[PDB]
Design a protein around this nucleic acid. Structure first.
Length: 173
RNA sequence: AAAAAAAAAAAACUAGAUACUAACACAUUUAAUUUUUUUUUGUU
């Protein structure tokens, strides 16, 4: 219900802000942070309306509309499976990783290739712990691109606890 | 070009520095009456 405001003159006072934005919509509160060191505001604010619709409408109407001391005001709005894999082949592109792990599970993000020791390793993000269980079951200690690869859980000691299965199960559901 | 959604000082010990509170108390106090204490030993 709160909208961000920016490009504010430090000479602007909370009174002037309120008088401005009440024209658009009823404003529940205005948090307009000040530096208590210098007693000087930082040129931005947070304006909390009563509901969301007033916030969105205010964003639409008041963005880049008004110049306060020539300054044009800005108005704006404002946990997953992971697998460590070791001994990868240098011929394996991240896209080839994607094609490998898609059949096992849907990737929430892209894998991350990093070198340890020289030693090609990667992190693979799955949306499911069970799909990752399939990826480990089939892919663990398996020869691809003429190189034996090891698939396990990435450390945090690693993922795959019981609470991990429960809360990941919930985040999926 | 951007936004940073509002909390930090200590504590202890030992000494030293300085404000301050409480209509606090400060020259009256003595004519009924308990410190008045002795191995009793004051005689028509």
């Amino acid at each position: 219900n709160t909208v961000y405001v920016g490009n504010i003159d430090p000479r602007i006072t909370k009174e002037q802000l309120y008088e401005l934005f009440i024209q658009i919509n009823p404003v529940l509160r205005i948090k307009y942070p000040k530096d208590k060191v210098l007693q000087a505001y930082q040129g931005y604010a947070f304006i909390e309306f009563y509901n969301q619709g007033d916030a969105q409408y205010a964003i639409k109407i008041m963005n880049n509309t008004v110049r306060l001391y020539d300054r044009l005001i800005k108005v704006r709005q404002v946990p997953i499976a992971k697998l460590f894999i070791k001994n990868l082949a240098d011929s394996i592109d991240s896209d080839q990783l994607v094609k490998i792990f898609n059949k096992f599970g849907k990737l929430i993000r892209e894998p991350e290739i990093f070198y340890l020791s020289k030693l090609k390793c990667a992190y693979v993000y799955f949306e499911d712990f069970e799909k990752a269980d399939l990826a480990i079951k089939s892919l663990n200690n398996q020869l691809v691109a003429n190189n034996r690869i090891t698939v396990d859980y990435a450390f945090k000691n690693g993922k795959g606890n019981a609470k991990y299965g429960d809360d990941v199960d919930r985040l999926l559901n």
